[PDB]
Amino acid sequence: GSSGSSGQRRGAIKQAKVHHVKCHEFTATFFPQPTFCSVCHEFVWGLNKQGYQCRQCNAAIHKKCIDKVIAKCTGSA
Ligand SMILES: [Zn+2]
Numbered sequence: 001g002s003s004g005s006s007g008q009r010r011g012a013i014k015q016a017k018v019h020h021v022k023c024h025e026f027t028a029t030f031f032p033q034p035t036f037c038s039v040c041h042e043f044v045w046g047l048n049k050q051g052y053q054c055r056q057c058n059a060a061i062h063k064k065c066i067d068k069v070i071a072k073c074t075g076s077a
């Protein structure tokens with residue numbers, strides 16, 4: 001005779017954070033389509049190439065084009 005309990009466990013959180021550069025929340029995102037950069041103005045359709053997309057203006061730019069960002073964010077309603 002015996003018995004046990006399935007047991008309930010949680011913890012599906014690794015890490016959460018956002019980079020604030022020139023009023024832009026760049027978040028590592030993978031663009032499934034070819035998008036032209038806003039700074040260098042180059043086709044961002046590279047295979048296995050993580051880019052950056054703001055949360056407000058939603059501007060797509062290369063990881064290296066993160067420091068070359070001057071334009072300010074306008075924001076969306
Ligand atoms: Zn922005």
Ligand SMILES: [Zn+2]
Nearest residue numbers: 037040062065
């Ligand atoms: Zn770029």
